[PDB]
Structures are given as C-alpha cells and as structure tokens.
Amino acid sequence: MYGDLGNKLVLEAKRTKQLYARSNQDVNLPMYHEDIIRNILKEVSNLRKNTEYLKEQQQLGMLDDKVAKCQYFVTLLCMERNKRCLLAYQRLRTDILDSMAWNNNGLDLMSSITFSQQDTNNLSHQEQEYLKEYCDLITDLKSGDLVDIDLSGSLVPPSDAFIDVRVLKDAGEIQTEYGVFNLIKDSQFFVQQSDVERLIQQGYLQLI
Amino acid sequence: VSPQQDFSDLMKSWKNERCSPELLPYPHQLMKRLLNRISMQSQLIENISMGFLDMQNESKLPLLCMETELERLKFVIRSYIRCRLSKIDKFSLYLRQLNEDENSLISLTDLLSKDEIKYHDTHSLIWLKLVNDSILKYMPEELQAINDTEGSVNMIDEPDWNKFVFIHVNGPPDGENEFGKPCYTVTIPDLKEEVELTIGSIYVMRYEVIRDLLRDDKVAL
Amino acid sequence: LPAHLQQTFSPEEIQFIVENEPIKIFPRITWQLITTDDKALNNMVAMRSTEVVLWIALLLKQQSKCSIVAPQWLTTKELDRKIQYEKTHPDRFSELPWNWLVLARILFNKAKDDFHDPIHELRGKIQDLREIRQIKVLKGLKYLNESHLQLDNLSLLEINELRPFITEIMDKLREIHTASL
Amino acid sequence: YYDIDDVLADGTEFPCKFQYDIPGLGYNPGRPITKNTKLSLPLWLARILAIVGPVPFVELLPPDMFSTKVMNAIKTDPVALDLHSINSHFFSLAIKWIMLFSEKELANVVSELLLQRAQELNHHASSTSTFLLKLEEMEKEIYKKSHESYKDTKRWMFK
Amino acid sequence: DDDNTEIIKSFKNFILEFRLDSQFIYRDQLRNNILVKNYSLTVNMEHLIGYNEDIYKKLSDEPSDIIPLFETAITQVAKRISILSRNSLPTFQLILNSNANQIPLRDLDSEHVSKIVRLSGIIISTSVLSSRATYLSIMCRNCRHTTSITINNFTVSLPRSCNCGPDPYIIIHESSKFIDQQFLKLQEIPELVPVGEMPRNLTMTCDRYLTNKVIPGTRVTIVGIYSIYNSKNGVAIRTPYIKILGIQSDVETSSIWNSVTMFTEEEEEEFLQLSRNPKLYEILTNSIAPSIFGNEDIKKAIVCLLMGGSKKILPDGMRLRGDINVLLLGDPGTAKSQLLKFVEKVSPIAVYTSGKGSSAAGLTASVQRDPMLEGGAMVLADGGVVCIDEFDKMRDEDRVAIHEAMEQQTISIAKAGITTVLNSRT
C-alpha cells in the first residue's frame, strides 16, 4: 500500500516487453503514462515533505530518539523504491526506443527523421527531445565512418549477393541513389543486395 | 601482419565479443589498418569498374567476387561495433565509476574507440538530461548521485565475471602451461578443484577463471 | 542495439562464419584479383583441383563455372563408421568436422548434383546422426553442475541452439550456490 | 535494479513481525505499532531491516511459501508441481531469501528442483501443452529464449 | 509370419525415408511427439499413397488386420530414436486424417464394412471413459501357468490350455497395462439429409489419445474404420459402430472450445490496444445487439453483467458476490427471449434454460443415484452466466433453491447419505 503503485507501474511496464517479445515487433507503444507517475511524484513529494518536517522535529521535539532513526530509514527506502520503479520503467522505454532509432534510420539517405514511430505525439515530448537528440547523436557516428555505413542496416548478412524484390504498392520511382530503379507497382527487380538493404526498410520491397 | 591474419583476428575478436558478458579492449592497431584498407579497395573497385567501360566498344566475375567480399567484411566490423556500443549503453555507469577511480586502467584512448568515447559521453549526457527533466524535479537528496547506495545497488552491475561462456580451447603447444595429461591450462577455480582443461574439447565455465586465457587467446569462445 | 538474439549467435551467423573455411574446387575456367584475404589464385586450371575459401566456391557454383569437391568425411560409407562408433560410446560425441550440420545444409542446396550418390541417402544419414546425437545431448544434460561440463566434440550449430538454455539455467543454478557459501 | 523481474520480485508480501515499537506508523491511527505485531511487508523494505539494528528490527518469520510442507512436496514431483500458482515468483524470490536468512539446507533442494524442471524444459524446447501454464515467470522467459533459438535454427535448416 | 516382417519393413522404410523437401516430416513428427510425451503419430494418407500405392492398397483392403502391424512398426522405430542402448515404451497410436471423399451418414449401408470411411456429423453426447486392456498377465487356477497375453486391436476369449478346464485363467490386475476408450455418439448434420425423418446416429469408439478430444455439440469430421459388434438385445442382427482413427475437428476448433486460462501474446497486445479506446464502453454497447433495435439501458446492462464484479472472500466466512441480476420482463416484441440467446452465445460459459428446467435437465442441483450430482442449470453453468425464461412459471421446490442460491452462491443438499454444500457462482 505504501510503495505498491510502483509495483503496478512496472507490472504495466512488463506488458510492453511482452509486446516487443515474440512479438511481433511493430512498435506502437500505447502511451507514456504521465498521470500515474504524477500520482507517484505527488506521493513522493508528500513523503520527502514529511521527511524534512520530521527532520526539523528531531532538532526540537524528538531529541534524537532511537525510534526517529526508523522514519529516516524506512521512508527513505520508499523514495528509493519509487526511483527503482521510475528508472526501471524509463530505461525500458529507452530500450524499446533507441533500438527503433537503430534498425531504421531509415535508410539511404536517411534522409530526415519523419513519419516514423507511430507513437508520434502520443508519446511524451520529453522523450522525443531525447530521441531527436539521440538520432542527432548517431549522425556523428554515421559521420566518423568511412566504412561505408549503412551501420543502421545489414544486421543480416548478404546472400548471394543478388536477390529478387517484388513491388508492394509503392510509387515510385523514387530510387535516385545509384540508379533510377523506376519503382512500379507489380514489378520485381533482379537487383544486388546493395540497394535492397536500403530500400527494404522503407516498405517498398517485399520478398527477399 | 598479413591480411588473412588480420581477418582471422577480426573474426576472433567478433566472436569473443558477442560471447563475453562484458566489454573487451578496443583493438585499434588492427581495426584502423582495416578502416584504411577498405577505404582503399572501395575506391579501387569503383575505379576499375569505371575504367572497364572504356574497353567497351567481358567478365564481371572478379568484380562481383570482390564486391561481395567487401559486403561481407563491411558487415563484420559493423556487427562488432554495433554490439560494443550496446554494451557501452548497458555499462555506461560502471564505466563511469571505472573512470573516476585511479586503478587500474580507465577508458583512455584504448579501452574505447576515439569514435566510441564520443558515443559514450554524449549518450551518458543526454540520458542523464532525459531522466533529469523527466523524473528528478522532484529530486531525492540522497538519490542525487547515480552510484552505489549500496543497494540495490545500483550499477555497479554488470561487470559479471562469473557468467558462463562456451569456450573452445586452442593455441600453440611448446611440445608454457601444459601440465598433462593432455595439455594446458589451469583453471584453479576458487570454489572448486581443477578439472583441469583439455585442448581438443570445449568446456563451459565462468568467464573470470578464463579471462587470462582470453587475453593470451589460448581459448576461443 | 543488436536486438536479437543477442547473447547467442544467429543460425545464419554461424553459416556466415563457416563459409570462411576453405575447401577444394574443380574450376571450368582457364584481373587479378588480390581481393584482400584470399591469397589465391593464379588463373585456375580446368580439370585441376585447388584450395579456395567457401563463399567464393558457392558464388562460382551459382554460375556453374566450378564444380566443388565433396569432403572426404561427407559420404554414406564414411558416415556409417561414425554412427557405428557413436552408438558404441554413449558418453562421448566422437569426432566431428564441427561444421558438419551447416555444411550439410549448404552443400546440398546447389552442389547436390556433384556428389556421388547424394540422393536420398546422405540426408537420411546425417538426419540420423543429427538424431541420436541430439538425444544423447539431452540425456547427457541431466548431469549438469557448476561449474563444469564436457561437451567434447560438438557442432557449432548444436552449441548455438541450446546455448541460451544451458548458459541461462547455469546462471540461475550457480547463482544460488556461489552465493550461499 | 532496472530489469522488471527483480523490481517486481521485491513487490511480494512477507509475514515479518517487529522486534521493536515504532511510533510514526506509515501504513493506521496507531500511532505506534505495538511490539511483536505481525505485519506483512514487501521484500524491498524488509530486506535491510533484518540487518540494521545488535538486535535486528524484524524477526523474519518464514514465508508460507517456504513452509516445510512445500519444500517437502517439491522433493516428490517437481515436474508436475505448479509453481505459478503459489507466488508466482520463486527463483527470483527464493534466491533473495536464501541469502537473507543464510539457509544452506534448502539450496541443495532448490538447486535440484531447477535441474528437474530444466530436464523437462529442454523437452518443450522441441517443436506446449498445459505445462507452459505452470512455469514461474522468469523460468517462462527462459522458455521463450530457448524455443526461439530452436525455432529460428529450424527455420534456417530449410530455405 | 515373414509377410508381417515384409509389411513392417515397408512401414519402417516409409517413416525413415520419407521426404517432403527436405525435412522428414514423419520422423520428426515422432521425436517432437515423444518429447512432449504424446506417444502418438499422425500419418497423412496423401503422403502415404504418394510413397507406395501398394501399402495403401492393402490398408484399404483389410485395415483391422494391418493397422496394428503399422503400430508395432512405428513403435519399433521410436525404440531407435527416443532412446539408445548397447523402456517402458507403449506402442504409439496413429491418427490418420485425410481428404478422400466424404461419405454421408445415410449412405453407409454395408458393403464398405471394414473399409476406411471419412465422414461428417455433430456429436451428441460423449460416453464416460472406461478402460480396455492392452497387455495383461494371466495365471491359471490350477497349474498356475503364467501367461502374458498381448491383446491388440481391433471380443477375444482367453486360451484354455497350459482338467484343466473349462477356462481356468485369471486376470492379474496388478500387472496389466490399460488404455482408455470413449464412445462418441454422433447425429448427422441437420442441413443434409433429414428430409422428413429423424437423423440416425452411429456409435463410435475413440481411444487413447483421441479421447476427450472433442466437446459434445461440436461439428467434426471422423475418419476411422467401419465395423460391427454383437450386443444381444436375432437373427442374427449385428449392430454397426465406427472405430475412430483418427479424429479431426472442424476449423479451428482448438482455442474455442478448449480455451485455457492461458492465451497467445498478441491477444494481450490487441486487448491492451482496445483498453485505450475512449469510445470503448460505447463501442461495446454497440456490439451486443446488431439485430436488436434500441433498448439501450438493457443493452448496456448486459455489458456490465458479463464483466462480473467485486468478489470478496474477507473474513469471516461471509463472502459478498458478483455479478448482480437482470430482469427483462415485459410484453412480447421485446426480443428479450432472443437477446438471451445472444448473451448465451457471447458469455464464455453459459446455459440457456427456460423452465421448469428442460427437457430432461432439471433446473437446479439434484441428487440422483447411479443405477449401477445429476446435473441441472446451475451446477453445469457454474462460474458464469445462466439464462432463464418464464421465471415466474418455475416450479416451487426448486424456486426455493434458487432464491436461496442467488445470494450466497451455494446450494445445500441434505438428501439421504449426502449432506454436501456445492457451489454455484452463477
């Protein structure tokens, strides 16, 4: 009853791992809960308020009682508990997030971060600032190499090395890089793994 | 110094990396001569591909071969570093505590890449900055610092040296460490008596007992 | 962020690895190329065997410009001595190329017409040697203790399939026991 | 720690009675809590109250889950025993309580139970039925990981 | 019996060498079946007839003399797979489901007797399990001959030879291995071909791993042999039954019925996606009566009914209940009597009984004795929804039972030597 709201919150955190697990991974997190954590923050503010109040009270009334220690001990733990929840949730949220910023940006010619992450505005803007700052953070890693990378792509090794891509209602032709593949619905291109990696992440290509 | 050897060591590093529970030294001496080498052949193949059209009013094979090869090896390191950056993402705090302490070897220019160090500090920074305007406002006075309380704990974890890793024992015999009956190495676990180790057979154990064998590359993972 | 798997290798990645092993070939052909790690070759002579890395043999086999040799250990008459030697030492896993599963998948997709008596035989043999060996692993897995195991000679694929399991419940098992002293 | 299983593991209630009186009850209008009151506490706070004192603040009365009836029943047929009903956390939990009370006796017991489940879980690692329903959450997670390695290695086996 | 060796060699060669490109479907069907401890195999006839036409030529000729040589043939294979040496391993049941040509129930008349017949009908009720025997030891009353009889399938008298006589052989039940049996009884589907007459029902014996595979009332398609048993009731007049190998329910039908407390992940996913709807309540209230027009208060009330409520076990033994009750009372054209059919459909476990109880079914918990709990609305419906009509027209004695039940959820029966208090959470 004392610290249990955090147990319920992480209990809810678990569900998103369930949705990232088997899964299938489309992202589409329901929302970031600002309300329930606001409840948590009001509860914890309550706590630390009574804490400094009693911290004033030992200075006068309690007179360093053996019992007093407990309040600064036990209730202190509760602060930690909320923290233990609040970060555990939060890191989970960054884990479901940064990976998404990894596997797709997105990808050639990134060329900008847009239309991605169906959560969009529904997810908190505090995370989105972190996010845009994070893909800005990875742009520098993109700028050190000189591989070339394409780090974002090709998690799965090339074979061999030409494939066949079947158009999937995409228009097209937007293939400007390397060559004008001239995208055309209902058209399969007997194209090398090279531009396939880049174009498959977008949603144009279908069968590898 | 041979290319093939740098590659075998690249693969070796890659496997040892994805296996072990924790981070390994950043091998710049090699990885940089490969980061120069690929910049060379990627320019070279585009040059020979462009010069090829001049004899055209034959065989695309060595070009296709070459290019496929380059796709393979440009995959390898990209897995490597895309992995290490993850372990940095998990160990950022631990590494920080490892940096503030004197002993023994901190990040420097060695333990992490000159590229990786940026990733580390910036990620760390923007992470602290995220959690700062998110849940610490509203900031507990004892919890101001991110570090051990202790308990529980936090992180600290996870330099976990006891985790199990499949290991396959390989290395040149002098006939150093071979005590018989078959061969090297010791072993001497702290909790248990030696097995000890046989070289033609893979033996799963803790990462800590074998870390020195790992350093010597006397056992593959 | 590797996502999957991540601690264990991917089934594909172990083929990505094994294709780095060299094996002999029979080139139909009679530039350069230096490539990087190959070291080979002077122009390959037709009707002459030579040693090259795998992924290139496979590559040149798709174009059917080269005929891969069968490994001396891949034969049914050869496998017979191996299952015979395996039934009779229920404890040890015998002697394995260590890639044999993955070469058994790879060389059968394309090269199949090159083998002498490939049909309905060897696949029957290795699907078997990949049976009794697997159950022998599950019955050798009861003896689990920390920290030791002899997995002796065992395929890379066989390692990779059961890895998360063993190296997880070893990390629940050894975890109480180290910590209870 | 950050993983959800641990922070959820600390959420579980234990029957721990107070060694001492503590006015300023945070649970209601006592105001103090009379000595030797039996109050259920989650593990997170109760964990260091048994250490800090040279007499500790709490007795640590053994949880109903660890009742010697249970630790006996798990020595018969673990494979048919239902863990998911009792807590459901066991290994995530029991691992803490074995260190907290420093009990040796049951190590040898649970160290056995977890082999006996697993010699069964390599059996459902091959490609459920009812059984998957009675695993402990964390154990269950390991089942995902194994089943996925196998499934993926089979899907690689052919085309 | 070198011929049986010749047949079984062909069955082994059919299991070990069969290739669908390139996995061996059967051989792995086997392993993946022994590990879960299923001890069964499902052959797909099309693969069979693809492999050899011959063995299917004989298997559609004299099935009941062959199929057990196929059982022993496959269990002799699991000996070389599941274990290795140099126990005990029951001889697996094979379940073969295949397309062929559907032979409707009315069209079964002789002539195909002992020839495998695929067909389709709605199961009426499932008979209570009883064991047949598989392997039983036998000792003589006099010379004490110890005989282990392997009884096979598919009645069989005991051997009289080691005065002695006439039949001095006792069944040792301490060592005898037993299997199970079911007895489905299936009424052919109402669409075809009832005409003007009541549809016939052929009695079927499921066994081993097909037993309890099917909830009564679900459409199925049985395969099995067709055969006849005696059962004195002349002359001679032997009566027809269908042995089943093996049963396959219609699409899907697993999950439902057969819906356990567990489910797949993506269902949690899409549920938790539905919990995020602002109109969620309001869209649900539109789901119930697509056909029924208006009556919105009722329409919502059903919703709040199905979802249960606060349930409290708090000490003392008193427990408060959920969830509520609903009265639709009013003149006809209210569609309430149809609406109930709907709730009956939606609710996870539901029993529509308009009575008085009907027809054979009593309305309440009732003690009846086994000639060698009788059932009712409440008991069979426990832990969920019960639908009642003509609620004013119900009998007195059980009316008492109801009005005592609905509040405390428990019916209490003091009749004769059983005083039990049994639960209705309905």
Short mmCIF file of N, CA, C and O in Angstrom, two decimals, chain E residues 173-206:
data_model
loop_
_atom_site.label_atom_id
_atom_site.label_comp_id
_atom_site.label_asym_id
_atom_site.label_seq_id
_atom_site.Cartn_x
_atom_site.Cartn_y
_atom_site.Cartn_z
N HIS E 173 -4.54 -58.18 -12.14
CA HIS E 173 -4.70 -56.75 -12.39
C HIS E 173 -3.56 -55.94 -11.81
O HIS E 173 -3.47 -54.73 -12.04
N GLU E 174 -2.68 -56.60 -11.07
CA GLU E 174 -1.54 -55.88 -10.53
C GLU E 174 -0.52 -55.66 -11.63
O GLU E 174 0.06 -54.58 -11.71
N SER E 175 -0.29 -56.65 -12.50
CA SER E 175 0.39 -56.30 -13.75
C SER E 175 -0.53 -56.48 -14.95
O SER E 175 -0.66 -57.56 -15.51
N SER E 176 -1.14 -55.38 -15.36
CA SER E 176 -1.88 -55.33 -16.61
C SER E 176 -1.85 -53.89 -17.11
O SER E 176 -2.20 -52.97 -16.37
N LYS E 177 -1.50 -53.70 -18.37
CA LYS E 177 -1.42 -52.35 -18.89
C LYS E 177 -2.70 -51.99 -19.60
O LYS E 177 -3.20 -52.74 -20.44
N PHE E 178 -3.24 -50.82 -19.24
CA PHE E 178 -4.56 -50.41 -19.68
C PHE E 178 -4.52 -49.09 -20.47
O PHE E 178 -3.63 -48.26 -20.27
N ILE E 179 -5.50 -48.93 -21.35
CA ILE E 179 -5.67 -47.75 -22.20
C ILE E 179 -7.05 -47.21 -21.95
O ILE E 179 -7.75 -47.69 -21.08
N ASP E 180 -7.48 -46.22 -22.70
CA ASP E 180 -8.78 -45.68 -22.43
C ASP E 180 -9.67 -45.73 -23.67
O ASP E 180 -9.21 -46.02 -24.77
N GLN E 181 -10.96 -45.46 -23.48
CA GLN E 181 -11.95 -45.57 -24.53
C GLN E 181 -13.06 -44.59 -24.23
O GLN E 181 -13.22 -44.19 -23.09
N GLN E 182 -13.84 -44.21 -25.23
CA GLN E 182 -14.72 -43.07 -25.05
C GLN E 182 -16.19 -43.39 -25.33
O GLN E 182 -17.02 -43.19 -24.44
N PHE E 183 -16.50 -43.86 -26.54
CA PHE E 183 -17.86 -43.93 -27.11
C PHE E 183 -18.58 -42.60 -27.37
O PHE E 183 -19.52 -42.24 -26.64
N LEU E 184 -18.15 -41.89 -28.41
CA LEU E 184 -18.95 -40.82 -29.02
C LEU E 184 -20.21 -41.40 -29.63
O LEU E 184 -20.24 -42.56 -30.06
N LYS E 185 -21.26 -40.59 -29.69
CA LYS E 185 -22.43 -40.96 -30.47
C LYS E 185 -22.84 -39.74 -31.25
O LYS E 185 -23.13 -38.70 -30.65
N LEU E 186 -22.87 -39.87 -32.58
CA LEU E 186 -22.97 -38.71 -33.47
C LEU E 186 -24.21 -38.68 -34.33
O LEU E 186 -24.53 -39.62 -35.04
N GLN E 187 -24.90 -37.55 -34.27
CA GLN E 187 -26.06 -37.31 -35.09
C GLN E 187 -25.67 -36.54 -36.32
O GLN E 187 -25.03 -35.49 -36.21
N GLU E 188 -26.04 -37.04 -37.49
CA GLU E 188 -25.64 -36.39 -38.74
C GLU E 188 -26.22 -34.98 -38.82
O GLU E 188 -27.25 -34.68 -38.23
N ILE E 189 -25.51 -34.13 -39.56
CA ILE E 189 -25.79 -32.70 -39.60
C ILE E 189 -27.21 -32.36 -40.09
O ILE E 189 -27.73 -33.03 -40.99
N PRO E 190 -27.83 -31.33 -39.50
CA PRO E 190 -29.24 -31.03 -39.78
C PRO E 190 -29.50 -30.50 -41.18
O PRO E 190 -30.63 -30.57 -41.66
N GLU E 191 -28.47 -29.97 -41.83
CA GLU E 191 -28.64 -29.45 -43.18
C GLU E 191 -28.97 -30.58 -44.17
O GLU E 191 -29.92 -30.47 -44.95
N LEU E 192 -28.21 -31.67 -44.12
CA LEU E 192 -28.44 -32.81 -45.01
C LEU E 192 -28.15 -34.12 -44.28
O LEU E 192 -27.22 -34.18 -43.47
N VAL E 193 -28.94 -35.17 -44.52
CA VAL E 193 -30.17 -35.11 -45.31
C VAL E 193 -31.34 -35.63 -44.48
O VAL E 193 -31.71 -36.80 -44.61
N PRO E 194 -31.91 -34.78 -43.61
CA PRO E 194 -33.02 -35.21 -42.75
C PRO E 194 -34.31 -35.51 -43.52
O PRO E 194 -35.01 -36.47 -43.16
N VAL E 195 -34.60 -34.73 -44.56
CA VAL E 195 -35.86 -34.82 -45.30
C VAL E 195 -37.05 -34.66 -44.34
O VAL E 195 -37.23 -33.59 -43.76
N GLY E 196 -37.86 -35.71 -44.19
CA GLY E 196 -38.96 -35.72 -43.23
C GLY E 196 -38.73 -36.60 -42.01
O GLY E 196 -39.59 -36.68 -41.14
N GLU E 197 -37.57 -37.25 -41.94
CA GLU E 197 -37.27 -38.23 -40.88
C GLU E 197 -36.16 -37.81 -39.92
O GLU E 197 -35.22 -37.11 -40.30
N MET E 198 -36.29 -38.26 -38.68
CA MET E 198 -35.26 -38.10 -37.66
C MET E 198 -33.96 -38.78 -38.09
O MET E 198 -33.96 -39.95 -38.46
N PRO E 199 -32.84 -38.04 -38.02
CA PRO E 199 -31.50 -38.47 -38.46
C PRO E 199 -30.85 -39.54 -37.58
O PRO E 199 -30.96 -39.48 -36.35
N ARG E 200 -30.18 -40.49 -38.21
CA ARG E 200 -29.63 -41.63 -37.49
C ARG E 200 -28.32 -41.31 -36.81
O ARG E 200 -27.62 -40.39 -37.21
N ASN E 201 -28.00 -42.06 -35.77
CA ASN E 201 -26.78 -41.80 -35.03
C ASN E 201 -25.95 -43.06 -34.84
O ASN E 201 -26.34 -43.98 -34.14
N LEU E 202 -24.78 -43.07 -35.47
CA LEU E 202 -23.86 -44.19 -35.36
C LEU E 202 -22.93 -44.06 -34.18
O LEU E 202 -22.37 -43.00 -33.93
N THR E 203 -22.77 -45.16 -33.44
CA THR E 203 -21.98 -45.16 -32.22
C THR E 203 -20.51 -45.41 -32.50
O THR E 203 -20.16 -46.33 -33.23
N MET E 204 -19.64 -44.57 -31.93
CA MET E 204 -18.22 -44.56 -32.27
C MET E 204 -17.31 -44.72 -31.06
O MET E 204 -17.52 -44.08 -30.04
N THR E 205 -16.29 -45.55 -31.19
CA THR E 205 -15.37 -45.67 -30.08
C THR E 205 -14.03 -45.02 -30.33
O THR E 205 -13.19 -45.57 -31.05
N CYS E 206 -13.79 -43.86 -29.71
CA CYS E 206 -12.47 -43.24 -29.70
C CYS E 206 -11.63 -43.96 -28.70
O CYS E 206 -12.15 -44.59 -27.79
#
